Structure 1
Amino acid sequence: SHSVKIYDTCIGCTQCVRACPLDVLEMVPWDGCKAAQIASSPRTEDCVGCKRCETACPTDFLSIRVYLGAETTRSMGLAY
C-alpha cells in the first residue's frame, strides 16, 4: 500500500480529488486556508500510485505527495 500525504500548504481547490481515479482522496473541513478545507487520504489501500493528484496540485512545491510503498493486488492495478 502506498502512502498519500497531504501537507499544510493546501489551498483546498479540490483538484487532487477530481484527478483521483481510485477514490482515494476526499475533502475534510479545516481552518488553515481561505477555502476552509484540506485534502485527506482515508482510502490509500486503493491507491494505485499513478500521481494524477500531484499533477493537479497547483501549489509550490506540492501540497499532496504520493510515496510508492508496498505493492499489493490493488496497488499494482491487476484485473487478474
Structure 2
Amino acid sequence: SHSVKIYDTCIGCTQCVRACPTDVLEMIPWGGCKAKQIASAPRTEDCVGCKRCESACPTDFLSVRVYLWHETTRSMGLAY
C-alpha cells in the first residue's frame, strides 16, 4: 500500500482530489486557510501510485505527497 500524506501548506484548491482515478482523497473541514478545507487520504489502500494528485497541486513545494511502498494487487492495477 502506497502512503499518501497531506501537509499544512495545502490551500484546499481540491484540484488533486478531482484528479485521483481511484477516489483516495477527500475534502474535510479545517481552519488554517481561507477555504476552511484541507485534503484527507482515508482510502490509501486503493492508491495505485499514479501521482496524478501531485501534478494537480499548485503549491510550491507540493502539499500532497505519494510515497510508493509495498505493492498489493490493488496497488499494481492488475485485472488478472
TM-score, L = length of structure 1 = 0.98
Query: RMSD in angstroms over aligned alpha carbons?
Result: 0.4
Q: 1:17 and 2:17 equivalent?
A: yes
Q: Distance in 1 between matches of 2:61 and 2:4?
A: 15
Q: Aligned-pair distance for 1:60?
A: 0.3
> Residue type matched to 1:74 in 2?
R
Q: Aligned-pair distance for 1:50?
A: 0.4
Q: Which residue of 1 aligns with 2:66?
A: 66
Runs of 5+ consecutive residues of structure 2 not aligned to the other structure? none
Q: Which residue of 2 aligns with 1:57?
A: 57
Q: Which residue of 2 aligns with 1:38?
A: 38
Runs of 5+ consecutive residues of structure 1 not aligned to the other structure? none
User: What is the count of residue pairs matched by the alignment?
Assistant: 80
TM-score, L = length of structure 2 = 0.98
Q: Percent identity?
A: 89
